[PDB]
User: Which sequence fits this backbone?
């Protein structure tokens, strides 16, 4: 019997609707999972900034650090321009909680419209150009020159490589348990652009390759290397070729987006932010102001993110059962939200997932 | 009108597709009033193996002093750094002032899936391609490397102006009565200002200001697209893009993504454009697995020649090449292995020539 203290950070828009749905899923897990939750309600996001002048209250971070074992983030309504006193609360949370990996599974449902795909993008989420170190080096009018630093470190790159191997191993354990897969063998694909960035991407590649040596249980996992541009080209036409894909920050950002495009509705696509002592689940869709409040938001991405978080926390069984219950609802196609072409609401689809659980 | 064209087949299937393109150029309709003189030039991996230099200075000299434009085939790039070798195409672009890499992607009329008719205009001189890197810390097991990304107002303004020129040209074609999936001309500026506020801020500002540099640009619509969702939209709704202007890395990635939309890589054209020269080049490489077998697809090269002709002010000749090519492709009788058939290079050249 394990208890998880989960920080709920619904934040903005449909985040306020899908997080309550996920709370209800978690409250109703079957007894065989031996998993109970305590929830703590936390404030963050654009609304928090409008009401208080801080997107990420200090109290939110402190409560996550001192009280919580994990967290679920909804969505932020990001402004389209720079706003004084505002910085992204998700970006800040990840930094503060030490969540160096951004993990996005892209997995089509058997029988769905669309190109079959079953991959995970493992994006290093601390460095590259996202160190945000820039200077206007020449300031003569009409002739300005700006520079930015792209930083790649061995320690950060080794960590992300090691996590890619962990995920590859975890997926192979699932196949061996009897779950059907389009992959016969596990594969980690290291993404780079060494023809241009010989030193920085050279170090990224070395670090990821060397990560395989960190656990002898990784040795049998196949490893290959691919140029980012080639990956983008291949995702459109043969995305079934990829299993686990590990990438530095900018390449991983772009690849996670290209891969997610293969799924009809973004309301289906999950993610998690992972560190050594903490995991924060997060659906990939944004705050959807266009439908917020209307009771129709698709909570499937959030359910699948909670499941992914549970996989990282050593609750493989509970995660598998969430995926099975969700997949059964979608395959039957009787209770579907409007983004999937149906006429059901958030609560109704939650009810159907719960009935299968 | 006379065009003196340098022919730089270089390696592999470059030696097959450039001759095919020569034959196409020699047999253009009388009506175009276009006469070609060709100069044969040496560059590429083969050149390096024989002489120790991939790009002879003499090749550069003859381009500068004798040619109006050039057609490059493909280089067989090594898999690792080789002492004395540097990419002759990167060097030719630098030496000839070809700052703009232009990558049109256009589907066939009647193709399955979303239609596409876009042009990616990639700034091709700076960004991370300045290749200024250093291992700043060398502590064993804890190394740290850094690279500089440089964005300049002058280079960004030049590429923005080129994007508006191309948008205006495409709009003039629509107005002539040639059907287009676009009803309004649009330049979309690619950026990631949420992270690169200074460098991409300067890129965006420079591209927006470029519109002010000629009054004939004023009717072109302008918007902005974040790198975060560029590929998402490209794959799902490519029909929404007309002209796309981007800095070097973002444009490199988006151009290769867009190439995936139209089937065989043997179909995908490019041109490298400067103020005083244009060099056509297919996107495919040297294809050593098929080189010498007479099965290379010359369509990318034909379309690259047409694109070059557009920049040189020969719009009608270009239009006629595109028409002849698309007819071969849509009829679907004469197709090389990359198009699923068993026809050869010469067969598809002949079919294009028959149509034109």
Assistant:
């Amino acid at each position: 019997t394990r208890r998880i203290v989960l920080g709920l950070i619904p934040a903005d828009g449909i985040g306020k609707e899908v997080v309550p749905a996920a709370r209800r899923l978690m409250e109703n897990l079957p007894a065989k999972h031996k998993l109970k939750f305590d929830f703590i309600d936390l404030d963050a996001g654009w609304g928090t900034f409008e009401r208080t002048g801080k997107a990420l209250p200090e109290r939110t971070v402190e409560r996550l650090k001192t009280e919580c074992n994990a967290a679920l983030f909804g969505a932020v309504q990001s402004p389209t321009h720079k706003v004084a006193g505002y910085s992204s609360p998700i970006v800040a949370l990840r930094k503060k909680m030490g969540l160096y990996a951004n993990v996005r599974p892209v997995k089509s449902l058997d029988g769905a419209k669309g190109k079959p795909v079953d991959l995970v993008i493992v994006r290093e989420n601390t460095e590259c150009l996202y160190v945000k170190e820039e200077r206007m080096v020449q300031n003569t009018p009409g002739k300005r020159v700006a520079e930015a630093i792209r930083r790649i470190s061995e320690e950060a790159s080794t960590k992300i490589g090691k996590m890619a191997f962990e995920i590859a191993k975890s997926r192979q354990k699932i196949r061996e348990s009897g779950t059907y897969s389009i992959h016969k063998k596990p594969l980690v694909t290291i993404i780079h652009k060494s023809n241009v960035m010989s030193v920085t991407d050279g170090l990224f590649r070395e670090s990821c390759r060397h990560a395989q040596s960190l656990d002898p249980s990784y040795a049998s996992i196949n490893v290959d290397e691919q140029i980012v541009d080639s990956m983008v080209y291949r995702l459109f036409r043969e995305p079934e070729c990829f299993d686990v894909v590990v990438a530095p920050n900018l390449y991983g950002d772009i690849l996670s987006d290209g891969a997610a495009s293969l799924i009809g509705s973004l309301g289906l696509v999950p993610s998690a932010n992972v560190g050594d002592n903490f995991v924060m689940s997060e659906p990939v869709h944004g705050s959807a102001p266009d439908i917020a409040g209307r009771g129709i938001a698709n909570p499937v991405a959030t359910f699948r993110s909670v499941a992914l978080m549970l996989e990282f926390m050593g609750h493989q069984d509970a995660a598998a059962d969430i995926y099975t219950a969700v997949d059964k609802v979608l395959t039957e196609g009787k209770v579907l939200t409007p983004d999937l072409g149906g006429k059901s609401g958030t609560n109704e689809i939650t009810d159907a997932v719960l009935a299968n659980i």
Summary: The two ends of chain B are 19 Å apart (CA to CA).
